[PDB]
Design a protein around this ligand. Sequence first.
Ligand SMILES: [Zn+2]
Lengths: 7, 193
Amino acid sequence: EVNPPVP
Amino acid sequence: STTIQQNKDTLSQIVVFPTGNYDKNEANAMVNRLANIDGKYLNALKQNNLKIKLLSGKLTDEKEYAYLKGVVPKGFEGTGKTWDDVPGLGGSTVALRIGFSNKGKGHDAINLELHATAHAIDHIVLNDISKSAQFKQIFAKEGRSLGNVNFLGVYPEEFFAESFAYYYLNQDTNSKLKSACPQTYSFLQNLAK
Ligand SMILES: [Zn+2]
């Protein structure tokens, strides 16, 4: 699992 | 103070610094901000051998994230950006660019390292609680009260991560969260009991 920060 | 030191000690077995030249003072400041996280979560990350990798370069220049080159992250449609341009990642791993902590440094999270580590805590420690029925109900009500509503209001795992970051960054963001999202605030409070 990979999740980005807020764009 | 003694609890702060304990959390820093725990983080010494989690944080991995990069090889070569890097900003040592800013990396230390980033660890200090992570030490505000409740020790129960940090100890669980250590027990799971979760590493918080600090980077002096692009995330996708690390062997394990090279597969993400050219890939548009979830929720980044229309930004013109790919993982090559994103300064932090959280989930089954954590990777963060030194110097990009603050809002506006290639991201709009309240704090990069807290948001990314919250993803790891959500997924590894709490078994994807942000996708639980309980949190989905909270997210359905309060998920659009912290801005960036086409992102935080659409993905419950992102609302969780950012709310977590507000809760633990400092007293001001903690107070802002309680005002804007009281059920999320109580949820996180009870999670830490
Ligand atoms: Zn995120």
